[PDB]
Amino acid sequence: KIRIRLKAYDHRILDQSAEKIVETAKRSGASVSGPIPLPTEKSIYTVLRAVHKYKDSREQFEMRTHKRLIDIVNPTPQTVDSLMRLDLPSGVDIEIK
Template identity: 50%
Template sequence: MPTKIKKFCVIKGPHVHKDGQEHFEIRTHNRLIDILQPTSKTIESLTKLTVPSGVDISIKL
């Protein structure tokens, strides 16, 4: 799955000098895991899985 990249350009100074800009980007990485023939124990362990902040998991049955 492709990485989504959002780029932002912000003017550094308080005036209208367009030469002084800073560039920022946010990268969103997506992963997909297919589990063939999952058991109830597999689904239960995935729902109880602890992940760091900023990481989201969605489970579709």
């Protein structure tokens, strides 16, 4: 009955914890739906390159955010406290329902 949203700046770091959640959930007997990759959100920042002049020369940076989604439909309290007391590496954002 719980929905978990995981979002981070790097997919490699993200997916390790994303899976760690699903194993730590289903090991204690939980019916869980696998991660669903939601669309990433990328934003662009264009800044002039020079200090004074030269508008014709620029440089563009980007920041892209990745997202996941986990569902559990028939939890048990053991799954609840296992997920809650489990700690993820800093760099991800977890929003437990």
